Amino acid sequence: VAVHNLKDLLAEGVSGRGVLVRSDLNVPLDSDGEQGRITDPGRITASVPTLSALVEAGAKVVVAAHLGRPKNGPDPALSLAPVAAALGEQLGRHVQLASDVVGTDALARAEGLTDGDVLLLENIRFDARETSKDDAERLALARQLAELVGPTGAFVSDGFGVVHRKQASVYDVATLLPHYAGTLVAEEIAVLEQLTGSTKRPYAVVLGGSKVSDKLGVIESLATKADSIVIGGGMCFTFLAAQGFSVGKSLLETEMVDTCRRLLDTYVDVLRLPVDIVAADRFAADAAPQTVPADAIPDDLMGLDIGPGSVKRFTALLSNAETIFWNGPMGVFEFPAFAAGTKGLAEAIAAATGKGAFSVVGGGDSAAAVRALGIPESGFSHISTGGGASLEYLEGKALPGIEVLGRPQPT
Amino acid sequence: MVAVHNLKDLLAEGVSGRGVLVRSDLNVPLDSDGEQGRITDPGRITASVPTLSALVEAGAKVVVAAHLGRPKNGPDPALSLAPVAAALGEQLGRHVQLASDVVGTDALARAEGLTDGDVLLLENIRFDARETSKDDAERLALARQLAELVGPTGAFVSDGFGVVHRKQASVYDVATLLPHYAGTLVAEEIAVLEQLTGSTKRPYAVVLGGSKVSDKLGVIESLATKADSIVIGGGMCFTFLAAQGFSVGKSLLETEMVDTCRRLLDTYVDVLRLPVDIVAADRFAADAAPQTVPADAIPDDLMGLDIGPGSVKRFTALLSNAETIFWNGPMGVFEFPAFAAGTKGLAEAIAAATGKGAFSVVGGGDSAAAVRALGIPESGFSHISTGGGASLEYLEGKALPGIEVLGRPQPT
């Protein structure tokens, strides 16, 4: 397997060459009010380095991207028209928008492209074949997409959030054209490799969130790769119950207790549990915080955050790590009295990063909610935005949109 | 005869055993790259809880109407409220049942069976095409079915501000069928917007960013007779600089708005404040070569990407003098570290002023993305508006239909 990158494609030459780019242009839209208003253009900005490199090298660029999850064909609220306008402003050139995906208009505009021109097809998910489980359906669309750039063309995959599922514009079209990872996909792979296959040690993982069942895949995969896995958040009380401790009124996934016991028995001393807990008598911001030992949680209290002794032990652990992966809050950080555990670990990871650690923040858009606490993104080596795709990578699943890029080029 | 009664007023009338229809804002962002049904920011669910909790504790039979996204034509499984019902129940500490329809057989059966303190979430109200119809008769027919769920003795609480600027059945027409009240979020947002339009402590400083003048034109012209200062930054400042007769190189320029900006600069010469310097570059890229240039001397082959350090110092001093502050829109391309200084500096100045007693309001999805990326805690502002177009139209001076309807007399 050899995943070629954009620099490899540029080295081959793209002057006058049709290049199909799968971009991530799935920007949030206002759906309280009038249609077609982008509320965060960040993904458009992120798409520019790949597209600008191809434009300046003289490629004829055709872009496939989706917006939302259209139910059954064209949906005016999910037209890429506002995306084409915003993308052109950031690219410094007009971006044509086809009035269809692979119909009359797309074909005519693609045939007329000259060196450096950019054509955005309409929302690729308007076509029922794009997300079909039927291989023959996806192949039919993939062939039409490949015909837009021609048999001398190339394919660049630059949307990491869709590489974990077989979609025509992501997977099948890569079997039809010489294929390359774009700058975003290549960078996410390079980061995720440092968390799975090529780990600089000590490697510390920090996992939070509410349910063990949601994190089980990542825990089991990383337990054979990391030196420590710090367990916080709401899910930590299920592990504490598996230790034989009572957890009062805390969140508890009773059906996962025996699984947590198996993990603690199997991956001995990898998992690091809280030693103290900030508990309260009710789920309220104004509830009196009580710091209790993790083995002496009172029956009438619920745990809402990891305690200061836990933050202290976890911080010391993180200060020695070469590699840090963090996904999920340590407590109910919306309540300021129960935000200290999350803020404390964020500060520890940023501090370690400033002294040389490689730190990756998982979660993508979900983790941005935590950053309402005042946590600058620049404090970390890499913010992963790959969502479910990134998590499945960490779980050790083979991602079809990545695997296909490593195949030999079609002859 | 105009009085917008609030939730305290409704509770004083009594809601024990009473059906109360609440229009909530539960339009949370979802992941649409991968599998359906994954909420990526539950903030709006958290915000909805105070109104719902108050009604639950007072014994109300609570029926919640809310939308998710913009369904094209009927039910859409990606836009079901199922994950919202689960998350809302977790925050309420009680089961929230999802009806399998909006005003159909299941909604009717479950509303009729509700008991004191129960919360029923109807399926996505926009699964019914009548909800957003321009036709009053269609909206009123749906509104009658919604009101039937809580019965003739019921009440209506409007608690989603972002939809009050357009007529929708669950927001506007149903308020004509029942005793009607603003919920805690709508009452709070109105009180905030009143400070920004009517009476508020001076000096009153407004800071507007983002890319397009035309998006902010109505707000600028409305607030220019109210605020002591309006700072213009972001991409839209270059259209104002062009309006002054200066060239702006490769900078973003709304040529159709140049004449309008000139008129605004002439009329409100004492209110509008433009940047005095700009950070410019030859490419739209984080590692482009940056130059700090006077705002009235942008070189021809450069594009302006941030306000400059002299501008940051001047605007920071202005915000440090303000008793009331309204901010909407980034000052530059903060996604690039080299062009984040203007947005970081302004947001930090507003938080500092707020810590020293100023009343600060932030609006806009791009402003929110910026404060989250740049490490300014949301708790550092007096109020973060999530209202969107509705808040902007209120600030433009438009009375909004979803607010007007709540001020009508209660039924007799």
- DSSP for B170-215 reads TTTGGGGTS-EEE-HHHHHHHHHHHHHHSS-PSSEEEEE-SS-HHH
Which one of A22, A24, A32 would you mutate to disrupt binding with B, by most B Cβ within 10 Å of its Cβ? A32
Residues A125 and A44 placed together within one structural domain of the fold? yes
Torsion on CA atoms A349, A350, A355, A357, rounded to nearest 10: 50
Residues in chain A whose C lies over 2.5 Å from the next residue's N (breaks after): none
* Structural domains counted in chain B: 2
Alpha-carbon gap: A265 to the closest alpha carbon of chain B (Å): 31
Residues A202 and A187 placed together within one structural domain of the fold? no
What secondary structure letter does DSSP report for B276? Answer: S
Alpha-carbon B205 to chain mean position: 19
Residues B91 and B209 placed together within one structural domain of the fold? no
Residues listed for chain A: 411
Strand partners, B96: B119
Which one of A24, A31, A384 would you mutate to disrupt binding with B, by most B Cβ within 10 Å of its Cβ? A31
B27 touches chain A (CB under 8 A): yes
DSSP reduced 3-state for B74? coil
CA angle A78, A83, A88 (to 5 degrees): 160
Residues B39 and B138 placed together within one structural domain of the fold? yes
Q: Is B69 left (phi over 0), alpha (psi -120 to 50) or beta?
A: left
A32: closest CA among A77, A67, A75, A65? Answer: A77
Is residue A408 exposed (0-12), middle (13-18) or buried (19+ Cβ within 10 Å)? exposed
B259 touches chain A (CB under 8 A): no
Residue B366 to residue A68, Cβ atoms within 8 A: no
Last residue of a domain, one of B158, B178, B195: B195
Minimum-distance CB partner of B162 among A32, A68, A373: A32
Q: What is the rounded distance in angstroms from the CA atom of residue A43 to the CA atom of residue B33?
A: 12
Q: What tokens were used for A11? A: 């080295």
A388 catalytic per annotation: yes
CB count in 10 Å sphere of residue B21: 30
Q: What is the rounded distance in angstroms from the CA atom of residue B61 to the CA atom of residue B21?
A: 8
User: CA nearest B390 in A: which residue?
Assistant: A33
Residue B284 to residue A52, Cβ atoms within 8 A: yes
What are phi and psi for residue A251, nearest 5 degrees? -55, 130
Please indicate if the annotation marks A37 as binding a ligand. no
Residues A290 and A398 placed together within one structural domain of the fold? yes
Which one of B33, B44, B213 would you mutate to disrupt binding with A, by most A Cβ within 10 Å of its Cβ? B33
Q: What tokens were used for A297? A: 């949680």
**Contacting residues of A for B93, CB less than 8 Å apart:** 283
| Residue position matching structure tokens 């803020």 | A343
Please indicate if the annotation marks A244 as binding a ligand. no
Last residue of a domain, one of A160, A194, A228: A194
Amino acid at site A342: T
Partner B, chain A 281-310, Cβ-Cβ below 8 Å: 283
Q: What tokens were used for A95? A: 């971006």
**Contacting residues of A for B69, CB less than 8 Å apart:** 31, 68, 77
Q: What is the rounded distance in angstroms from the CA atom of residue A360 to the CA atom of residue A185?
A: 16
Residues A144 and A205 placed together within one structural domain of the fold? no
Alpha-carbon gap: B389 to the closest alpha carbon of chain A (Å): 6
B162 touches chain A (CB under 8 A): yes
Residue of A13, A112, A388, A406 with catalytic role:
A388
Cβ–Cβ < 8 Å for A179, A409: yes
Q: What is the rounded distance in angstroms from the CA atom of residue A323 to the CA atom of residue A192?
A: 11
Q: What tokens were used for B292? A: 């700090």
Q: What is the rounded distance in angstroms from the CA atom of residue B36 to the CA atom of residue B80?
A: 9
Please indicate if the annotation marks B311 as binding a ligand. no
Q: What is the rounded distance in angstroms from the CA atom of residue A315 to the CA atom of residue A346?
A: 9
Residue B29 to residue A365, Cβ atoms within 8 A: yes
B402 touches chain A (CB under 8 A): no
Cis? peptide before A202, omega within 30° of 0: yes
First to last CA, chain A: 16
Residue B252 to residue A89, Cβ atoms within 8 A: yes
Please indicate if the annotation marks A139 as binding a ligand. no
A68 touches chain B (CB under 8 A): yes
Q: What tokens were used for B225? A: 């007779």
Which one of A24, A69, A118, A282 would you mutate to disrupt binding with B, by most B Cβ within 10 Å of its Cβ? A69
Q: What is the rounded distance in angstroms from the CA atom of residue A207 to the CA atom of residue A188?
A: 20
**Contacting residues of A for B165, CB less than 8 Å apart:** 33
What's the number of CA atoms in the CB half-sphere (13 Å) around residue B294? Answer: 4
Residue of B43, B89, B117, B212 with catalytic role:
B212
Strand partners, A206: A230, A326
Alpha-carbon gap: B164 to the closest alpha carbon of chain A (Å): 9
Is residue B212 exposed (0-12), middle (13-18) or buried (19+ Cβ within 10 Å)? middle
A233 catalytic per annotation: no
Residues B85 and B36 placed together within one structural domain of the fold? yes
Amino acid at site A87: L
A116 catalytic per annotation: no
Residues listed for chain B: 412
Q: What is the rounded distance in angstroms from the CA atom of residue A234 to the CA atom of residue A302?
A: 10
Beta-carbon contacts of A103 under 8 Å, excluding residues fewer than 6 positions away, are none
**Contacting residues of A for B46, CB less than 8 Å apart:** 334
Across the beta sheet with A290-293, the strand order is A290-293, A276-280, A302-306
Cβ–Cβ < 8 Å for B354, B373: no
Q: What is the pairing mode between strands B277-281 and B303-307? A: antiparallel
Cβ–Cβ < 8 Å for A333, A343: yes
Residues B54 and B153 placed together within one structural domain of the fold? yes
How would you write chain A as a 3-class SS string? CCCCEHHHHHHHCCCCCEEEEEECCCCCECCCCCCCCECCCHHHHHHHHHHHHHHHCCCEEEEECCCCCCCCCCCHHHCCHHHHHHHHHHHCCCEEECCCCCCHHHHHHHHHCCCCCEEECCCHHHCCCCCCCCHHHHHHHHHHHHHHHCCCCEEEEECHHHCCCCCCCCCHHHHCCCEEECHHHHHHHHHHHCCCCCCCCCEEEEECCCCHHHHHHHHHHHCCCCCEEEECCCCHHHHHHHCCCCCCCCCCCHHHHHHHHHHHHHCCCCEECCCEEEEECCCCCCCCCEEEECCCCCCCCEEEEECHHHHHHHHHHHCCCCEEEEECCCCCCCCHHHCHHHHHHHHHHHHHHHCCCEEEECCCHHHHCHHHHCCCHHHCCEECCCHHHHHHHHCCCCCHHHHHHHCCCCC
Residues B249 and B228 placed together within one structural domain of the fold? yes
Q: What is the rounded distance in angstroms from the CA atom of residue A364 to the CA atom of residue A27?
A: 13
B236: closest CA among B330, B365, B362, B335? Answer: B330
| Residue position matching structure tokens 């200062």 | B229
Q: What tokens were used for A177? A: 């054209």
B178: closest CA among B156, B158, B149? Answer: B156
Q: What tokens were used for B397? A: 């001076």
DSSP reduced 3-state for B328? strand
Residues B46 and B109 placed together within one structural domain of the fold? yes
Cβ–Cβ < 8 Å for B341, B370: no
Domain residues for the domain of B233 are 196-412
Alpha-carbon A115 to chain mean position: 33
B226 catalytic per annotation: no
Cβ–Cβ < 8 Å for B143, B170: yes
For residues A16-46, one letter each, b for 16 or more C-beta atoms within 10 angstroms of the residue's C-beta and e for the rest, the string is ebbbbbbbbbbbbbbbbbeeebbbbbbbbbb
B171: closest CA among B132, B134, B141? Answer: B132
A328 touches chain B (CB under 8 A): no
Minimum-distance CB partner of B40 among A31, A68, A366: A366
| Residue position matching structure tokens 């074949």 | A129
Cβ–Cβ < 8 Å for B262, B241: no
Please indicate if the annotation marks B365 as binding a ligand. yes
Residue A32 to residue B284, Cβ atoms within 8 A: no
Q: What tokens were used for B326? A: 């309204």
Tell me the H-state helices in B4-132.
Answer: 7-13, 43-57, 82-92, 105-113
Alpha-carbon gap: A134 to the closest alpha carbon of chain B (Å): 17
Cβ–Cβ < 8 Å for A145, A64: yes
Cβ–Cβ < 8 Å for B30, B80: no
Across the beta sheet with A323-327, the strand order is A271-272, A228-231, A203-207, A323-327, A358-361, A382-383
Q: What is the rounded distance in angstroms from the CA atom of residue A133 to the CA atom of residue A128?
A: 10
CA angle B389, B393, B394 (to 5 degrees): 120
Please indicate if the annotation marks A165 as binding a ligand. yes
Distances (CA, A) of B384 to A40, A236, B368: 16, 32, 8
Q: What is the rounded distance in angstroms from the CA atom of residue A233 to the CA atom of residue A242?
A: 16
Last residue of a domain, one of B137, B171, B195: B195
| Residue position matching structure tokens 């939809």 | B163
Residues in chain B whose C lies over 2.5 Å from the next residue's N (breaks after): none
B29: closest CA among B87, B72, B95, B73? Answer: B87
Amino acid at site A8: D
Residues B89 and B201 placed together within one structural domain of the fold? no
Cis? peptide before B203, omega within 30° of 0: yes
Alpha-carbon gap: A411 to the closest alpha carbon of chain B (Å): 31
Minimum-distance CB partner of B375 among A71, A336, A374: A374
Amino acid at site B87: A
A370: closest CA among A314, A315, A409, A327? Answer: A327
B185: closest CA among B219, B155, B162? Answer: B162
Residues B138 and B23 placed together within one structural domain of the fold? yes
Q: What is the pairing mode between strands A154-158 and A18-23? A: parallel
For residues A364-399, one letter each, b for 16 or more C-beta atoms within 10 angstroms of the residue's C-beta and e for the rest, the string is bbbbbbbbbbbbbbebbbbbbbbbbbbbbbbeeeeb
Alpha-carbon gap: A102 to the closest alpha carbon of chain B (Å): 21
First to last CA, chain B: 14
Alpha-carbon B53 to chain mean position: 23
Please indicate if the annotation marks A255 as binding a ligand. no
Provide the number of CB pairs (under 8 Å) joining chain A to chain B: 134
Q: What is the rounded distance in angstroms from the CA atom of residue B356 to the CA atom of residue B382?
A: 11
Partner B, chain A 69-108, Cβ-Cβ below 8 Å: 69-72, 75-77, 89-92
Torsion on CA atoms A85, A89, A93, A96, rounded to nearest 10: -10
Q: What is the rounded distance in angstroms from the CA atom of residue B214 to the CA atom of residue B194?
A: 24
What's the reported resolution, in angstroms, to a tenth?
A: 1.6
Please indicate if the annotation marks A125 as binding a ligand. yes
